[PDB]
Amino acid sequence: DTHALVQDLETHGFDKTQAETIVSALTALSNVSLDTIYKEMVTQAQQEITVQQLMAHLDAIRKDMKQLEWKVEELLSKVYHLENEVARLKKLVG
Amino acid sequence: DTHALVQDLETHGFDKTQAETIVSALTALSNVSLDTIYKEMVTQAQQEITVQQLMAHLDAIRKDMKQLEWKVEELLSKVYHLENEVARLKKLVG
Amino acid sequence: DTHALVQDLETHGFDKTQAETIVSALTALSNVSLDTIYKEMVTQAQQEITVQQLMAHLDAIRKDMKQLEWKVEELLSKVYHLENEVARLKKLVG
């Protein structure tokens, strides 16, 4: 912050005006630089949103896979029951 | 950029040489610090490439999931058809 | 880093104390800015770790996918074999 920096310069061989204008210049470049960085780079907030979205895709796929697994298990049981019926039929006619 | 900053210092109790050397120091640190940031941090253009790659992986898995779903559906239709055939056969053999 | 900057100021119309306090101010703002940037933005090192974690989730899903594929193959074989048995049975009774 401004005070303790302007305060420091004044008490180490600078004027009021010299210390404030120096600090005005430091702030000026700081703020334009940060502004350029925040625009060009990826913020942690943007990253968090992207990651949540990718985890939402992964969760939807996992959910589908579970459902398909359950549907294959049901088909397997029905196939089992038909195998028994068919084996029984073969015996009757055979 | 340089001008209005050196201009400001000179007109607030600094020399030509004092204002330029100050500004030379600000530039020096700004430029090395930015250079270190632009190298160490992720740009939007790099993010986009990474995200697209992750979305391509997710799309391939979704596409494999769809094909497997279709293949289970086919199996389902065949099992249904065998259920009906077997029920018909049981009827014939009395 | 500090030296050649304090050295430059002194030799261009500044004191020992004036040159060091200026440089102390440049360091102060540099370091708070960088600290704010490192907290708010995504580094390449962070990105690599996040990407590896997402790829570990994708690899777990691809692994589960293979096991479900195997299970569909086992259903398919059983369904195919029942189709043949049934086709044969229909001929015998038909």
Any idea what the CATH number is for the domain that residue A21 is in? 1.20.5.340
The domain of C22 spans 1-94
Q: Which amino acid is at C64?
A: D
Angle of helix B44-92 relative to helix A44-93, nearest 10 degrees, comes to: 20
Nearest chain B residue to A47, by CA: B47
CA–CA min distance C55, chain B (Å): 8
Three-state SS string over B64-85 comes to: HHHHHHHHHHHHHHHHHHHHHH
Task: Give the count of domains, chain A.
Answer: 1
Chains contacting C (3+ CB pairs below 8 angstroms): A, B
- Judging contacts by C-beta atoms under 8 Å, the chain B residues touching residue C42 are 41-42, 47
Contact B18, C16 (CB under 8 A): no
Contact C42 B42 (CB under 8 A): yes
Q: Which residues pair with B43 in a beta bridge?
A: A41
CA dihedral A43, A45, A49, A55 (to 10 degrees): 90
**Exp. method:** X-ray
Classify residue B42 as left (phi > 0), alpha (psi -120 to 50) or beta: beta
CA distances, A6 to each of A3, A67, B6, B28, C6 (Å): 5, 66, 19, 21, 19
Q: Find the CB nearest C5 among B25, B72, B86.
A: B25
